[PDB]
Amino acid sequence: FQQLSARLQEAIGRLRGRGRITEEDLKATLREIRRALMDADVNLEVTRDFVERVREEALGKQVLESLTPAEVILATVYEALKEALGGEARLPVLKDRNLWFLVGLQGSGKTTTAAKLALYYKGKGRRPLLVAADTQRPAAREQLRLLGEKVGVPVLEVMDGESPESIRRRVEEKARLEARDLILVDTAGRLQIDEPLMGELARLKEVLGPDEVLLVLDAMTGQEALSVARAFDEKVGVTGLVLTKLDGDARGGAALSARHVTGKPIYFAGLEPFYPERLAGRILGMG
Ligand SMILES: [Mg+2]
Numbered sequence: 687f688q689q690l691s692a693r694l695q696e697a698i699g700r701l702r703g704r705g706r707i708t709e710e711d712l713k714a715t716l717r718e719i720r721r722a723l724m725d726a727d728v729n730l731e732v733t734r735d736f737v738e739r740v741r742e743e744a745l746g747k748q749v750l751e752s753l754t755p756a757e758v759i760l761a762t763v764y765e766a767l768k769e770a771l772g773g774e775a776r777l778p779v780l781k782d783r784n785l786w787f788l789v790g791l792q793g794s795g796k797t798t799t800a801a802k803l804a805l806y807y808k809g810k811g812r813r814p815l816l817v818a819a820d821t822q823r824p825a826a827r828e829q830l831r832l833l834g835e836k837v838g839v840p841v842l843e844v845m846d847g848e849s850p851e852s853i854r855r856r857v858e859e860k861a862r863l864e865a866r867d868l869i870l871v872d873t874a875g876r877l878q879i880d881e882p883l884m885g886e887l888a889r890l891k892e893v894l895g896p897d898e899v900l901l902v903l904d905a906m907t908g909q910e911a912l913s914v915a916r917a918f919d920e921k922v923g924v925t926g927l928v929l930t931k932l933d934g935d936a937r938g939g940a941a942l943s944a945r946h947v948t949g950k951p952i953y954f955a956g957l958e959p960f961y962p963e964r965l966a967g968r969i970l971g972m973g
Pocket of ligand 1: 888892
């Protein structure tokens, strides 16, 4: 998160080699951190809580008596970033059979993520089945067919206007014949959220009964990504998130605000498992 990393590092760096710092020195730093977070598109309330968390913790660490307050602030900011990011790494719970939905807008990288996820679990010994569930657009189904072909994972393409009941029947049949134990359903991706889309997704959910509903989000959209996350959760109901294009995000607002705003864990980063602790370190220039 380029710009956030630099600002945070410069802020902590300013207190380096000054001996003990004053009360206003601390407040100044806290103000630099707050401004750094707002610019990174971190939610207003999340930013507010972050700065207070660092204040309370640092004071608890006797920061004003410290001869190396910069180290105390460093550790405190690291801890706050780690927690904001999710705290500890989390992954979906696999069982005998699993059917998960991959939901998100067109452009979130939902379809490529579906294939990437299948390859990831195949490597762990699972037998995935990709399901191209867009009942209106053949091109979207073809894209996943091609992707599955490349990653060596089977793809079931629904037909135009196929009912949720027919989709369930065919999916169940293929899974039985091919001993598939992880079904990844790539739902319809559209440029914007419209009620008809959400209604079909909600219906498809009632019929297929997925164990997990993964919302794929383009990290580069910032807070907007969480607005989308709220909508999808209210209309369909999500269980976890996948943030793509993290390398392009010089900010980090979405990743840093997700837990607080949505209450949903970030399972994967666009692809490998999401590691809060590892990213908190990289943000501070140590990763
Ligand atoms: Mg219902």
